[PDB]
Amino acid sequence: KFPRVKNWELGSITYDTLCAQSQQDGPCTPRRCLGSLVLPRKLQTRPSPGPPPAEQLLSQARDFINQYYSSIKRSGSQAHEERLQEVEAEVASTGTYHLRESELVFGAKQAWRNAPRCVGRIQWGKLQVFDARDCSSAQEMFTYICNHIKYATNRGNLRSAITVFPQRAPGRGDFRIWNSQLVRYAGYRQQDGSVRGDPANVEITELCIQHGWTPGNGRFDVLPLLLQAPDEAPELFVLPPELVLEVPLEHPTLEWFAALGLRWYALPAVSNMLLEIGGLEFSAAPFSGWYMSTEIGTRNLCDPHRYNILEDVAVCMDLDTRTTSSLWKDKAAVEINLAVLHSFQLAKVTIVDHHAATVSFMKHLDNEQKARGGCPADWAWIVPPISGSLTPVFHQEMVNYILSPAFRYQPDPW
């Protein structure tokens, strides 16, 4: 029943009992494990043209309300029972309900706390929640988003935040941010199929031009935002330059590195995920924190399907790209990650290296074992893309499961 979890570096053992609370199903079964899969077959979040079944919604809601009043230790009070009534009363009559602002804040924080793929959860209790549920146009979304970016960036002293737009409603379209992140670099597909810029953003770059954007021809052109109000075509909004803090990349010792013209933005803000709290769904709720250096230095810059600059740098370092055994890739990667940390630290922009991050996560695991008797963690995502076993999380067994509130993936609006 309850899994025996072991840390092989320390020999310590814990028993995860928090997974018993998981009401949702993952992709695995006894016959085979799909734990390495990036996306579900359909766990997503299907359309909302019709009202969700009252019995089910009612149980998800009651559960959440219980979680909330338990958090403020008023579990069992009259306020607790009267809230349950309000929810039940609203669901029976309208087939849905709404959250009190304080509940939304608790839910947003809990959703982050429960995110199996997030290594920065030690900061889960510190999150600025912007209630944007009174938004009625793409234009309003834009203002809210600009407010978020301004607050989160904080001139380099990044602060974790989330802006919650109106929940999905049965019958009408969803509020949606088409871009996967608030800040993305364009990816211009050329004649021969190749790409200029960030290959991960070819599709969204094309959709933007399709909706009237005047593109550029650089590798780091900040894309505009395509915001979508219910049952309306998305609108294009160019983010104000002064709001998008970027950090130019240079290396502490290699003078030629800066000449590469590489750079990256300071704010990591996912905007395509769905936030589920007590059965309610927020199709537009962008959240941001700060980068862990490997995200930029290892994945964004070195992935073959991303900027793929490994050989460029290796050649500049005069390394032997002839054979794999010279470890030219490993050497180049290290300097690239070093340049990222150096540049951000020099620019006074919040950043965390993978060693510090995983060290904090181990502490978080400890806190959670005492607090909830477990912690859902996706080993493949928690262990960094470089120096895996050099970090403590590599040697820590983990249990992965779905808890709610949760951040979930959802279909692209197009």
Ligand X SMILES: Nc1nc(N)c2c(n1)NC[C@@H](c1ccccc1)N2
Q: Distance (Å, rounded) from C-alpha 372 to C-alpha 404?
A: 14
**Count of residues touching Zn ion (by CB under 5 A):** 3
List the end-to-end C-alpha distance of the chain, in Å, as a whole number.
Answer: 42
36 binds, among ligand X, ligand HEM, Zn ion, none (CB under 5 to 8 A by kind): ligand X
Q: Is 163 in the site for ligand HEM (CB under 6 A)?
A: no
The residue whose two tokens read 């927020």 is 282
Q: Tell me if 28 is assigned to a ligand binding site.
A: yes
* Minimum gap (Å) between residue 87 Cβ and ligand X: 36
**In Å, how far from its chain's centre is CA 287?**
7
| Sequence-ordered list of residues with C-beta below 8 angstroms from that of 365, at least 6 positions apart, any chain | 375, 377, 396
C-alpha triplet 140, 143, 149: angle, nearest 5° = 140
110 phi and psi angles, rounded to 5 deg? -65, -35
Which DSSP string corresponds to 292-320? BHHIIIIIIHH-TTTT--HHHHHHHTT--
Q: Tell me if 208 is assigned to a ligand binding site.
A: no
* Minimum gap (Å) between residue 115 Cβ and ligand X: 11
Q: Is 115 in the site for ligand HEM (CB under 6 A)?
A: yes
Handedness of CA 204, 205, 210, 211 (dihedral sign): positive
- Catalytic residue positions, numbered: 118, 121, 290, 295
Q: Distance (Å, rounded) from C-alpha 356 to C-alpha 258?
A: 26
Window of 27-35, 258-266, 288-296, 307-315 that interacts with ligand HEM by CB under 6 A: 288-296
Q: Distance (Å, rounded) from C-alpha 241 to C-alpha 246?
A: 10
Q: Tell me if 118 is assigned to a ligand binding site.
A: yes
Q: Is 388 in the site for Zn ion (CB under 5 A)?
A: no
Phi-psi region of 151 (alpha: psi -120 to 50; beta: other; left: phi over 0): alpha
Q: Is 189 in the site for its own copies (CB under 8 A)?
A: no
Give the three-state DSSP class for 231: coil
Q: Tell me if 380 is assigned to a ligand binding site.
A: yes
Q: Is 218 in the site for Zn ion (CB under 5 A)?
A: no
Give the three-state DSSP class for 97: coil
Q: Residues 345 to 364: which contact ligand HEM by CB under 6 A?
A: 352, 357
Window of 7-15, 24-32, 47-55, 92-100 that interacts with Zn ion by CB under 5 A: 24-32
Q: At what angle do helices 54-71 and 101-114 cross, to 10 degrees?
A: 90
The residue whose two tokens read 């500049």 is 316
Structure tokens, 376 = 């859902």
Q: Tell me if 302 is assigned to a ligand binding site.
A: no
381 binds, among ligand CAC, its own copies, ligand X, none (CB under 5 to 8 A by kind): ligand X
Q: Which is nearer to ligand CAC, 244 or 316 (CB)?
A: 316
* Minimum gap (Å) between residue 399 Cβ and ligand HEM: 17
Per CB under 6 A, residues contacting ligand HEM are: 112, 115, 117-120, 123, 127, 160, 162, 270, 287-290, 292, 295, 352, 357, 381, 407
- For the annotated binding site for L-arginine, the residues are 181, 290-291, 295, 300
Q: Which residues are annotated binding-site positions for Zn(2+)?
A: 28, 33
Binding interface with its own copies (CB under 8 A): 3-6, 8-11, 16, 19, 22, 25-38, 41, 298-299, 302-305, 310, 324-327, 329-331, 333-334, 337-338, 341, 345, 353, 355-356, 359, 376, 378-380, 383-390, 394-395, 397-401
| Binding-site positions | 28, 33, 36, 118, 181, 290-291, 295, 300, 380-381, 394, 409
